[PDB]
A and B are shown apart, each in its own frame.
Chain A
Amino acid sequence: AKNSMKAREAKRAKLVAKFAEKRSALKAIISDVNASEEDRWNAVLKLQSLPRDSSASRQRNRCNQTGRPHGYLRKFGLSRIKVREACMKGEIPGLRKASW
Chain B
Amino acid sequence: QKVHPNGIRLGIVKPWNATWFANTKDFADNLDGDFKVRQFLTGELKKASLSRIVIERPAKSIRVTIHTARPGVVDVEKLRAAVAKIAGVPAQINIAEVRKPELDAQLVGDSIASQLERRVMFRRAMKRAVQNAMRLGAKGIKVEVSGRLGGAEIARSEWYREGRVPLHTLRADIDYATSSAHTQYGVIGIKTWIFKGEILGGM
Contacts and interface: CB of A to CB of B under 8 A. Distances in A.
Q: In the complex, A touching B, CB below 8 Å?
A: yes
Interface of A: 64-65, 74-78, 86-94, 96-97
A78 B31 contact: yes
Contacts, number: 58
Interface stretch (B1-9, B122-130, B184-192): B1-9
B20 A93 contact: yes
Contacts of A97: 3, 7-8, 10
Contact of B31 (A76, A89, A90): A76
A63 to B, nearest CB: 10
A92 to B, nearest CB: 6
A76 B8 contact: no
Which of A74, A76, A91 gathers most chain B CB within 10 Å?
A91
29 contacts: A64-B28, A64-B32, A64-B35, A65-B32, A65-B35, A74-B24, A75-B28, A76-B27, A76-B31, A77-B29, A77-B32, A78-B31, A86-B31, A88-B6, A89-B6, A90-B7, A90-B16, A90-B17, A91-B34, A91-B35, A91-B38, A92-B18, A93-B18, A93-B20, A93-B21, A96-B11, A97-B3, A97-B7, A97-B8
A86 B30 CA distance: 13
Contacts of B34: 91
B93 to A, nearest CB: 18
Contacts of B3: 97
Contacts of A77: 28-29, 31-32
A39 B22 CA distance: 44
B19 interface: yes
B24 A91 contact: no
A90 B10 contact: yes
B15 interface: yes
Interface of B: 3-4, 6-8, 10-11, 14-22, 24, 27-29, 31-32, 34-35, 38
B157 to A, nearest CB: 20
Contacts of A94: 16, 21
A65 B36 CA distance: 9
Contact of B16 (A74, A76, A78, A93): A93
A93 B29 CA distance: 13
> Ordered nearest first, which 6 A-B pairs have the shortest CB separation?
A77-B28, A88-B7, A88-B4, A90-B17, A96-B10, A64-B32
Contacts of A78: 31
A84 to B, nearest CB: 9
Given A75-B27, A77-B28, A90 B20 contact: no
B28 A74 contact: yes
Contacts of B20: 93
A79 to B, nearest CB: 12
B18 A90 contact: yes
Contacts of A93: 16, 18-22
